[PDB]
Amino acid sequence: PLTEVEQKAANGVFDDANVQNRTLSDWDGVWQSVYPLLQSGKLDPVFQKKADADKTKTFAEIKDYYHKGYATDIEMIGIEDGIVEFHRNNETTSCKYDYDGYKILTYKSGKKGVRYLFECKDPESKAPKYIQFSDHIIAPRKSSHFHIFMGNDSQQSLLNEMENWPTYYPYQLSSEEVVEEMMSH
Ligand SMILES: [Zn+2]
Ligand SMILES: [Zn+2]
Ligand SMILES: [Zn+2]
Ligand SMILES: [Zn+2]
Structure with a gap:
């Protein structure tokens, strides 16, 4: 249903x-x-239609961007009931994360983002200690896909990564369904 104001927001325009x-x-x-x-x-048509509206960019450099961009070996995240389970190699870790606020970011492009931060306070879980969702939303609302940043250093390091953002869409969707979305977008 996305409003029009929620849309300038997804584009990185919003008042802090x-x-x-x-x-x-x-x-x-x-x-x-x-x-x-x-x-x-499977995602080329996306990277295509994008170099089609960027003269600074070739299909090549876009693809390379999303390569470095999406690379994770957490194949699959499942989140429910306060817990976040990560699937990497026929083995999950999980942890009951705790909300620890949000950082507002301003990118090198003058553009802005909000990382919603969580932390694992479980001595006995083996999940990443620090996670940060960023999903192009700035206020309560169910995600449609998200980037998660994850680490065991601090929150600030994650805040520092602009290089990797493992990116997640819902499991229901077909490949055809995923691309469709990243175009109508
Ligand atoms: Zn401020
Ligand atoms: Zn699995
Ligand atoms: Zn993004
Ligand atoms: Zn989308």
Whole structure:
């Protein structure tokens, strides 16, 4: 239903006074890394239509951007009931994360983002200690796909990465369904 104002927001325009707190369950769902769709060339039409409206960019450099961009080996995230399970190699880790606010970011492009931060306070879980969802939303609302940044250093390091953003769409969707979305977008 996306409003028109929620849309200048997704594009990185918003007043820092409009961001609001979100909860872990904006991101409940079972979810699939779109990386394998990069790798089998399933996403090219996206990177195509994009070099078609960017004269600074060739199909080549765009693809290379999303390659470095989506690379993860967390194949699959499942989030539900306060817990986040990561699937890397026929083995999950999970942890009951705790909301720890949001950082507002301004990118080198003058453009802005909000990372909604969480942390694992479980001594006994083996999940990443620090996670940050960023999903182009600034206020409570169910995600449609998201970037998650994850690490065990601090929050600030993650805040520092602009290089990698493993990107997740819902498991329901077909490859055909995923690309469709990244165009109508
Ligand atoms: Zn501020
Ligand atoms: Zn698995
Ligand atoms: Zn993004
Ligand atoms: Zn989308």
